[PDB]
Amino acid sequence: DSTSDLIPAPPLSKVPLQQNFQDNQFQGKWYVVGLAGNAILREDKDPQKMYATIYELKEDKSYNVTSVLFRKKKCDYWIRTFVPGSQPGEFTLGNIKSYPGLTSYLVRVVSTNYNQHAMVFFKKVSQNREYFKITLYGRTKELTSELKENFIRFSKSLGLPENHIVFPVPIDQCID
Ligand SMILES: O=C(NCCCN(CCCCN(CCCNC(=O)c1cccc(=O)n1O)C(=O)c1cccc(=O)n1O)C(=O)c1cccc(=O)n1O)c1cccc(=O)n1O
Ligand SMILES: [La+3]
């Protein structure tokens, strides 16, 4: 029982796909240097801490994806599987049945140079509500003003206001 009001997910026609996606070069550790989405809210009481996501390419060409977060003085690990979709750089969540209320989960790599930065679009339908987010990944915990401005411009092109765009604060715990 609830009421919720969400910015509509953009059509996938507004979400570019990285041309010539190289699955092997996308592997390894990425820091989440920016987050934007219809359920992302800027919060000054506890500013969002940086977390890291590790992509491991399996023999079957799916990714094992592990996120590491620092929560309540401990390292929290979330492991899931990204299964190759219709085109290189697109994925769906493996074993969708195992997530209560989840009916769809889509991943699209928008842009990357593999060795510094990536932007990744996520869309999911959970309890019949449609959520989307854009993750700005860095190989380091800092990125240039130009890459952050490009991320803001792309996020606003998908209908997100300033207060749905956050830059998690770098930490050392868990993600080094
Ligand atoms: O709107 C989105 N995200 C921003 C709000 C995050 N949040 C704020 C506290 C969440 C803290 N955790 C979650 C870590 C553990 N999670 C899970 O065991 C999990 C199970 C099933 C589906 C799923 O998605 N997760 O994460 C993250 O920091 C975290 C790290 C890495 C990847 C990641 O995805 N998350 O969230 C939410 O509670 C939330 C609200 C609405 C939808 C939603 O999926 N989540 O997690 C969104 C849109 C489209 C796809 C998508 O996956 N997400 O998250
Ligand atoms: La999530």
Side-chain angles (χ1 to χ4, degrees), residues 1-41 44 47-58 60-96 98-145 147-148 150-176:
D1 292 9
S2 65
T3 298
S4 159
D5 292 4
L6 295 174
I7 296 160
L12 294 179
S13 77
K14 290 230 295 293
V15 182
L17 174 69
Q18 173 62 53
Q19 56 151 37
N20 191 30
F21 179 72
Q22 302 296 305
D23 63 353
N24 62 308
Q25 291 204 50
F26 198 74
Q27 290 187 97
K29 186 199 262 171
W30 293 101
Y31 294 101
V32 176
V33 302
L35 267 177
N38 67 345
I40 296 288
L41 206 68
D44 318 13
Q48 159 89 62
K49 302 191 184 203
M50 189 166 288
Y51 61 90
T53 301
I54 303 161
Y55 285 77
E56 285 167 333
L57 193 57
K58 298 204 278 155
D60 69 4
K61 296 285 150 247
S62 278
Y63 286 117
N64 282 158
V65 187
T66 310
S67 292
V68 190
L69 298 81
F70 182 51
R71 186 179 146 282
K72 300 185 134 56
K73 309 171 199 183
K74 301 214 195 184
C75 306
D76 294 357
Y77 297 93
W78 177 39
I79 300 173
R80 69 286 198 192
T81 304
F82 289 1
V83 178
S86 63
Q87 292 191 101
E90 292 195 29
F91 306 87
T92 57
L93 189 60
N95 197 14
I96 202 136
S98 73
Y99 303 91
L102 193 61
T103 53
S104 66
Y105 195 102
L106 169 57
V107 184
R108 184 173 291 188
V109 181
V110 176
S111 58
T112 185
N113 72 347
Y114 302 102
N115 57 38
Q116 295 176 317
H117 57 78
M119 291 198 306
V120 184
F121 174 88
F122 303 81
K123 185 171 78 67
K124 86 166 192 170
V125 178
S126 164
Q127 293 74 16
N128 302 120
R129 293 182 298 210
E130 190 166 33
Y131 299 97
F132 72 101
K133 70 164 176 197
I134 315 85
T135 300
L136 180 64
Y137 289 142
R139 290 305 195 172
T140 65
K141 300 180 208 178
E142 269 290 298
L143 289 174
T144 64
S145 305
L147 295 169
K148 284 183 305 191
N150 188 71
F151 170 67
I152 293 165
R153 168 180 203 104
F154 179 62
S155 298
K156 297 195 96 177
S157 81
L158 300 190
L160 293 175
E162 294 290 328
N163 63 1
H164 283 71
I165 307 171
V166 304
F167 295 94
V169 57
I171 62 168
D172 287 338
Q173 294 95 341
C174 299
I175 70 177
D176 294 351

